[PDB]
Design a protein around this ligand. Structure first.
Ligand SMILES: [Zn+2]
Ligand SMILES: [Zn+2]
Lengths: 299, 290
């Protein structure tokens, strides 16, 4: 274990950390926890909002990933995290592209040698020795191929990290992650969130989404934990999303945001999780932990 | 010619603005002038110093140009310039690489249609109406293909901008290396100015230095401007490292170079103002009535 708590979030693209776990990250950094984010790709295949950087996309100059390094860096800082960590090194494994898009590249993350991807993340785990690790559920949240792959890699890495390896002269330093969570979308919290939005929250060109285009929400019964952050944490999440300016636009009141598809989304203080490995601590009347560190003895 | 002076520097790659003109840019912005820099490529084909960003290069992830946007932005801000301007839009025309090289892209600046490149720069000039424009000499300084191309495009644009909305650039300069100042700067360096891996230069590693009689103007830096130049170079961390005393720097080849605040120019168009005992203007704006 040790004295200051340590948490690790493993994501696919720049912005995933803020969209999924921004409020949770800021929550824990503000309480003196050591939090790191690992990002598995630079996001080379992203769309761009606005004209200024529009020629950086893969179908033009194809330089978007390098630009998003600065966005990620600023977003992490807003969340209280000091620097990005790109799996295998910045630029190692390329954004694999949205589902269904047939993509040309011989460096795609989904195609990468599991020995290398898993090996890279085992090293990070063993170095950082996180008490909590967080990543996507098996369907990668909304089904993005890198999200699914990030889940597969991270699951395998968590399993390998605590197992003895290395040679007689170079023994591994194994670390068994105490608690392993999937970050997931809470269906009910989202409905509540969308329903609380007023026209003043939206930009004129944004459309509210209907049931069908949203999406893959867990029921309260499928959820094991929540971090219910305060307004200071939520405002950090807002600032982190604003920093990903090519990817995400925050509305006039900071209550809502939208990606390039112009679907308005609420920016919530509550973030939900499924416990995939380890022992739960105390659960409330919903059956949820209210602290990812629960049972680990920091309180 | 509004009485606030307006200056435009046209460069090939991120860092060229600070290596060539950093002190001059800071000198003028600190004095309330309107200064802009146009950068013609993102520098996609650059090498990288250090391991952190090493896989960004064109023979790995090929994403370095997008990363260098932030380096340029920070460098510009250290010089008092609020934002980068990439010719034709960020990413329009690619870094063409060193001479002799070597690439898959057909978006190279050197191969670009003159109508588009010159057209783009003409629009910027008519928009900014600079009193002074600066770019490389005809050999592009040290001969980088993009630097030669930048000179060619800028020269064509300056000529075209004032022909029938039109702006005739009052004064057009080439930024050049001063031979004498480079020799003296190199000589003044001591091993403490360098980092472990760097090599002190000699009479050998010079090349394209202009003589004092071939120079028309100098902007002599005060300490605030030199310090801004040093901060700007430092911001281009993938390309340039400043030494421990801030008096020397080196690119990826590890050849130490003095950080010479005094920057020299050849008047390529327009009329000179007052010259000093060296035969040099000491202000690019000389004779324009500010
Ligand atoms: Zn993603
Ligand atoms: Zn250059």
């Amino acid at each position: 274990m040790s004295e200051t708590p340590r948490l690790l979030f493993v994501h696919a693209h720049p912005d995933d950390e803020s969209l999924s776990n921004g409020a949770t990250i800021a929550h824990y950094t503000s309480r003196g926890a050591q939090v790191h984010v690992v990002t598995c790709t630079l996001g080379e295949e992203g769309e761009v909002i606005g004209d200024r950087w529009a020629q950086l996309t893969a179908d033009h100059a194809d330089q978007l990933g390098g630009y998003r390094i600065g966005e990620l860096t600023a977003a992490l800082r807003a969340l209280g995290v000091s620097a990005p960590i790109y799996l295998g090194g910045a630029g190692r494994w390329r954004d694999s592209g949205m589902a269904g898009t047939d993509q040309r590249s011989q460096r795609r993350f989904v195609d990468a040698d599991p020995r290398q991807t898993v090996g890279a993340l085992v090293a990070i785990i063993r170095e950082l020795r996180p008490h909590v690790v967080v990543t996507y559920d098996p369907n990668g949240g909304y089904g993005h191929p890198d999200h699914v792959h990030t889940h597969t890699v991270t699951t395998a890495a968590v399993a390998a990290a605590g197992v003895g390896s290395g040679t007689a002269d170079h023994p591994g330093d194994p670390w068994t992650v105490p608690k392993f969570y999937w970050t997931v979308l809470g269906l009910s919290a989202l409905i509540s969130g969308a329903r609380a939005l007023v026209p003043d929250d939206l930009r004129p060109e944004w459309v509210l989404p209907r049931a069908d285009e949203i999406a893959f929400g867990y029921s309260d019964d499928g959820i094991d934990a929540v971090v219910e952050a305060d307004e200071q944490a939520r405002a950090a999440k807002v600032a982190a999303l604003a920093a990903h300016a090519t990817q995400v636009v925050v509305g006039p009141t900071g209550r809502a945001a939208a990606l390039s598809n112009n679907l308005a989304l609420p920016i919530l203080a509550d973030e939900h999780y499924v416990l995939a490995g380890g022992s739960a601590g105390a659960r409330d009347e919903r059956g949820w932990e209210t602290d990812l560190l629960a049972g680990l003895g920091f309180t």
